[PDB]
């Protein structure tokens, strides 16, 4: 048993200290499924994954399989992919179009809303069907992205997102046409804890600007150029959300990393011309000079991560303390030129799939970290999250909210600090913004 006291002591944001047991302990894992995944807003995909009536995506909330499905009234319904009779999976494929769903075990039939409409031999054997359909999640959409939450007490999505939204709009709100998902969702398995993946995208430009991605960068520069010429960006900022453990980081004015990653046509599109002007115009209300932002990472706590200029998105599905699945897709402006959509597609494949020249080095690190945490002494001393400690300020002229340097772990400490709060505060009365 884990006391709330014992839990509060796992993360110290004032000293910048993290207890390594957070990444490996089985008991904390099972508590996370209740206290974190059981009541957070989790990303399921984009509206365009399910555009027409009956279109469905089978996905996860924690280790709970769920079905995301468009309704006739254009609403999106999300219910548990589990029959309340004997637990069978109702929707048994990845995606498609359904007129209804039928349990393959005993024939209990559901409408596309997840409502139990038929039970074979009901008169001869029975009970209200309106109470025996699968558990529904709350569904909210933020500019295309579809989110779900089990907990009726949890704040609404917008309140939950708070002052993180400006940095989501950088990617999501550049045109009145909105975003669309390029077809296809890549899925793969990494034997590490979800928090390493979530933290890296929340807070860790450090690893991309140091050693992890030297070879990724090398793959992306011209053949004639070598690493000794590689343009190091050191200008940038980091955002920690007012509430919720969200965080983002980005480079400023230095297109070195974006150009290597996304090529010249995407970099020019993101920074110069009609689309880039309109985006800055559309985002003027936040005051941000979005065209000076060249390469950004972000996490919406716990497990929604994305790279704005590059438009790669990922959902981390936890599979115990020692495993995750990565489900990845990419977005483009719905009204982007064919040539640009094609650039985003090819470079997202080249850099960020399981074969990606960036992704490869990420998983290699995470895998060894987790293996180390099997050791007793490897868990006996805190890890260092002291970088940038006491250096952030809520009054930056360019960027809103709690802002520090690009190489910092203020967003990180915020993430672990909020993880700790969700783990130690049973009741939303205290937990809410």
């Amino acid at each position: 048993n884990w006391t709330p006291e014992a839990i509060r002591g796992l993360v110290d944001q004032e000293k910048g200290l993290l207890d390594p047991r957070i990444y490996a302990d089985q008991s904390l894992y099972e508590l996370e499924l209740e206290r974190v995944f059981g009541r957070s807003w989790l990303l399921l995909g984009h509206e365009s994954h399910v555009p027409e009536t009956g279109d469905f995506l089978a996905t996860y909330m924690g280790e709970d399989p769920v079905v995301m499905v468009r309704q006739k009234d254009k609403s999106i319904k999300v219910f548990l992919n589990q029959c309340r009779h004997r637990g069978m999976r109702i929707c048994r494929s990845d995606a498609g179009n359904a007129k209804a769903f039928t349990c393959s075990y005993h024939g209990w039939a559901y409408d596309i809303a997840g409502k139990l409409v038929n039970v074979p031999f009901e008169k001869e054997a029975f009970f209200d069907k309106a109470e025996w359909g699968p558990l529904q999640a709350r569904v909210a959409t933020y500019k295309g992205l579809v989110f779900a939450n089990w907990d009726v007490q949890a704040p609404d999505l917008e309140t939950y997102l708070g002052d993180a939204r400006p940095y989501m709009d950088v990617m999501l709100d550049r045109t009145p046409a909105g975003t669309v998902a390029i077809g296809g969702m890549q899925k793969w398995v990494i034997p590490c804890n979800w928090k390493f993946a979530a933290e890296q995208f929340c807070s860790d430009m450090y690893h991309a600007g140091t050693t992890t991605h030297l070879s990724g960068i090398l793959a992306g520069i011209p053949p004639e150029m070598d690493l000794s010429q590689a343009q190091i960006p050191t200008k940038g900022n980091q955002f920690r959300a007012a509430w919720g453990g969200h965080g983002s980081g980005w480079y400023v004015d230095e297109p070195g990393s974006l150009l290597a990653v996304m090529g010249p046509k995407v970099t020019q599109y993101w920074t110069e011309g009609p689309a880039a002007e309109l985006a800055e115009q559309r985002l003027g209300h936040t005051g941000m000079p979005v065209r000076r932002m060249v390469g950004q990472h972000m996490t919406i706590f716990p497990t929604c991560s994305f790279l704005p200029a590059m438009n790669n998105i990922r959902i981390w599905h936890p599979r115990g303390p020692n495993e995750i699945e990565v489900w990845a897709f990419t977005l483009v402006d719905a009204d982007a030129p064919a040539e640009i959509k094609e650039e985003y597609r090819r470079h997202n494949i080249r850099n960020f799939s399981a074969g990606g020249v960036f992704e490869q080095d990420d998983g290699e690190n995470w895998v060894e970290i987790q293996k180390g945490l099997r050791g007793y002494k490897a868990k006996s001393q805190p890890l260092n999250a002291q970088m940038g400690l006491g250096r952030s300020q809520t009054g930056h002229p360019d960027f809103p909210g709690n802002v520090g340097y690009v190489y910092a772990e203020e967003a990180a400490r915020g993430m672990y600090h909020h993880w700790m709060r969700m783990m130690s505060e049973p009741s939303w009365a205290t937990l809410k913004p």
Binding site: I182, G183, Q186, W188, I349
Partner: protein, 180 residues
């Protein structure tokens, strides 16, 4: 991606033998990390491709594979393959330094002629066994659909196109740091 449309009349024994041998030589290059020598086999118009694969009800079976407009595991040109070869031979390419230990077992080779003389459409099956670090093992199976052209090199052929159909939906490996 239906059954390979093999020609009625089988390839000649010599042609059959030559293409199997090409593949065996290619496997030896890859399994011995002769990345420079392997890249030399890629023609300038190479399209190297590995589509995503999904679970679908039979009635929706046509949606199994991703198309040219969707994401993929690989979707490469000579240029981008070059970058990958630069990374995999790089001291700071962590995913393959230390390198992995791989075996490309090649079988089921079916050779088909094309409208271009000395250009061949080739189907084959594989198991790629990848062992890495202390105890990591990833096993892949699938087929490859190549377009090969006769070439004056040490292998006899160049690769104009490769499609790899992997027997997987969710990849069970943490990465694809290997070549297919």
């Amino acid at each position: 991606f239906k059954t390979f449309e093999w020609p009625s009349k089988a390839a000649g024994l010599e042609l059959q033998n030559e293409i199997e041998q090409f593949y065996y030589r290619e496997a030896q290059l890859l399994d011995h990390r002769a990345y420079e020598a392997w890249f030399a086999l890629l023609d300038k118009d190479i399209h190297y491709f590995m589509p995503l694969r999904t679970n679908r009800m039979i009635r929706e079976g046509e949606l199994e594979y991703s198309g040219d407009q969707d994401l993929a595991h690989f979707d490469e040109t000579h240029e981008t393959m070059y970058g990958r070869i630069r990374k995999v031979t790089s001291d700071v390419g962590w995913a393959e330094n230390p390198p992995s230990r791989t075996r490309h077992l090649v079988s089921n080779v079916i050779v088909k002629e094309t409208a271009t003389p000395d250009t061949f459409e080739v189907n084959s099956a594989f198991i790629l066994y990848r062992n890495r670090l202390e105890r990591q093992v990833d096993i892949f199976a699938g087929e490859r659909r190549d377009v090969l052209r006769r070439a004056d090199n040490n292998l006899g052929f160049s690769i104009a196109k490769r499609t790899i159909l992997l027997d997987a939906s969710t990849l069970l490996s943490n990465n694809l740091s290997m070549f297919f």
